[PDB]
Symmetry: C5
Subunit: 252 residues, 5 copies
């Protein structure tokens, strides 16, 4: 049972905080400027360890050059850029077998339900899923409806659709966007059934209290925890705020 | 003879009812709200068992997390969403070999004849058919003409085309849309020849009686039975209505 | 020499009549209504045997469910529908190895020279040809220029091009459309060289004598014979007319 | 060194004349009418033999049915038609391994640099080149920039780009269009380096003297020789003229 | 550690100069006219060794026909032409296994982040990276954002994105465009982390001092060095200027 394996490694305290760090390919380095140490993967590993978080998310190149075994790794297999203008598509740049060789405890893959290329990602995810089972690595699916008929990615019905597709296609855990309130988010959590749900972090909020309030709602809705990037490492008080998130999530 | 195998497993009584549950990927969970337990695959397996139905249809993810061997399983290999806007296409997210491993007694695959991508699904179906034969699992084809010159999906000439194509491509059983009357639907059943036909369920009808009359016509036309989803599990009286169907079909 | 094998099996008397029955996927069942028994493949095999024809053409599904070894079989590997609107393309839904398993004495494949997808069909034919040689099954190519710059499919120069392409790509026998006169059709036959040419039957003619006169012209032009579908099985005097064709051709 | 092998087989006298005969697929049979024997591949082999030429170029189908080992063979692996209207593309209809079995001493492949599909042919050529090395058969590249920014294909800078691309991708010999003058053609020859260059024949010229003048310029420019089709076999005095070309070139 | 192997072979003195020579396919031979010996790969090898440079970059054809082991070789696996008008895409014409056979010490591959085909190059780069690791050959990525939202290829934010992408995808070393000042270029170097950066050379500058000042900025920003093509071999004083570059960099 790969969901059970995921919970043992990444949620030993009953809830989970993952520090996401695929931003270098997805958005590029501009956002690293507010807190420049954030461009150094070594800083990121130290932050996760010092805040007592459960894991980090790296692309293959960062894992090969920097990963040191100090915190559990989710190897994010696909990536795309914001420079791209076509229908949303993100293809694998790494195999599951290679992810095992790089020290990963799980693999990650993004889908964009609704995209004109939704079929390309479903076809490839099928091969990745089959390999994840073969190598006994849990599959974490980032489910982000985008393209086609999608006009509001945080609409209650779109987030609940995101959650259900990830379950149907074989995710062992998933990452989805927050709706902005615990009632509607609790429906997304419910339709995901046995597969745990992590809140996607998002752009840096206006105040720390805005983000902590969103986290409180996610937990109230029955989610497993958060996968946070910018709202930790883009802050100059990254470590102090990370430790406040830990107390909210693990203590609450 | 995989048609004979299909009939032994899914139609021991001479007719068949399958509980379809691929909705979560195909349409998303919005329809689960009317009867909120319908979002729970465990609740769906109990309903099939308790109503005395022949089978359930799950995608790979639901089968892996929830299937427990209690009712025969058709593993639906491909899936698409209603968020998608392009030419109709649905690709396999699971192999026949993996279906066998998940406890399947048959495999399912949707084609959309007429689509700009009709070739992509015929190409994949060729591989799935070869594997279904190799692993001795019957192939059930959902045949839904869509795109291209198709305007009315329930027109008699379109449903008959859907049925003939499924036979020509190697289906051991098929699922097609009802025409709305037994005479035209009997032509589709005829052109399917030795391959049995199941009626696709469709959106929840205005009354329970509206659906019962549809099923009556389907049986009069010589079809094997029904593959029903929403017209059972979207109802708050799901089990009661499911037992009325069983009495009708069997 | 796979042409020699083809002639031994399908042209023992020196000329050939093949009964074509891929119409269920290519056009759908609409035309079967004229002579309803034509929707039953069992009836098709009976017609072929009782007229003394040389072979039949089936898709994999039909061959799997109905072929009984009583008349030599050409297994048609690709198929498309008329519901499709894109640039013309037809992909294989069956392999040569599977055709051998179903009892085929030859395999068939359609190309559409000029299509925006002409590359896709040439790439797949290459794989099929290689397999046909490996399994020692003659390859019969239906050569139907369509799409791109093709405006009149029965123009003398288009039919000659169709014939030559089939030869160049490795056809062991071919099937092309009639130009409507023996002089221009004799040029298509000449440019096909050592590869024998079968006339494509086409839509049902206004009278039986119109079709017989086409056949007379085809034989005058030096063609091996005819692959006929509708002009036999769409008629209620199917057997009687089939015997008249056998009289003329043999 | 596959260039040295190519020269030993196809240029024993120091220069080369290759009789090209892929016209049947590339342009169709219309041009065979002037000298009707040109439609017959046997006549082509006799002509190359009687004239003392170095080789012939056949597609796989012609080689399989007609090639008799009497003159060295280049097997042209890819082919497209003039009926096709999309971005220029020509895919392989035969493998290198199959070419070896059919008696080829070399393989041929066309690229269209600048095409929207240039990537598709470069991707396939990589596979063909790897196999050419594996089977020890020289690779002859027909380099014909077409599509994209290309307008006039005989412009000096386009023909030089054509020659350089063929060298860079791994050609052991190449075939390119003439610029119409020896000075610009010699720059194409220079940037091709160690890889020898054959002039592409082109449409039949107004007079025999026009063609002979072109050949004189190609030789002055330092090319290896010519790959001639129409300008030999489209003539009623084909053998007489072919013998005059032999006297000039050798 | 393949970065360490790259540094040992191509940067033994602590900084690196590579002589790039994929121009023949990427741009064509027009530029070779200014200094005509530049069309001859033997001249390019002699130039790199006489100037004391660390390496040369060749496509497969040039390496097969001309490489002699005299200077370390980076085999550039993909290539496209300027004749092409679509969304930027460049596909492999050679495998890592073949590059090993041709004497390569590293392999090169270009990506165009932002292109409508960015996925096609990421998917291929995945297989190349896997093979680079298997055969123990460093992977050098040319990262040139182009297409999509990219409108200024030398903007600070774009060159930093180029560098970061190459790190994320598995490059052991990278080549990117200069921003025009050392402060913004040092941010690109920083975000590349442990992966060394080479400056892409570009079109011939108006003066030698314009290029020398760029190279001075590059070194000030902390880059490993330069991969120069035109700004050396397009000059009539190629060797003199190459020796001045070496004095500055080493």
């Amino acid at each position: 049972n790969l969901t059970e394996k995921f919970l043992r490694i990444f949620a030993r305290r009953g809830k989970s905080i993952i520090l996401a760090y695929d931003h270098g390919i997805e958005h590029g380095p501009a956002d690293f400027m507010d807190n420049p140490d954030s461009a150094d993967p070594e800083y990121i590993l130290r932050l996760a360890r010092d805040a007592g978080f459960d894991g980090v998310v790296f692309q293959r190149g960062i894992a090969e050059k920097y990963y040191d075994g100090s915190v559990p790794l989710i190897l994010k297999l696909n990536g795309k850029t914001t420079l791209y203008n076509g229908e949303p598509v993100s293809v694998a740049n790494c195999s599951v077998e290679e992810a095992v060789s790089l020290g990963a405890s799980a693999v990650g893959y993004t889908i964009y339900p609704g995209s004109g290329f939704e079929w390309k990602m479903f076809e490839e995810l099928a091969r990745i899923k089959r390999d994840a089972v073969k190598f006994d690595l849990p599959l974490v699916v980032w489910s982000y409806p985008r393209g086609g008929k999608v006009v509001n990615e945080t609409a209650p019905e779109i987030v609940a659709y995101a959650a259900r597709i990830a379950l149907e296609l074989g995710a062992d855990a998933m990452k989805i966007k927050y709706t902005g309130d615990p009632k509607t988010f609790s429906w997304a959590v419910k339709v995901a059934g046995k597969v745990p749900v992590l809140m996607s972090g998002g752009p840096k909020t206006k105040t720390e209290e805005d983000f902590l309030k969103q986290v409180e709602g996610v937990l109230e809705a029955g989610a497993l925890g958060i996968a946070v990037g910018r709202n930790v490492w883009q802050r100059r008080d990254a470590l102090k705020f990370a430790r406040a998130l830990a107390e909210l999530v693990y203590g609450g």
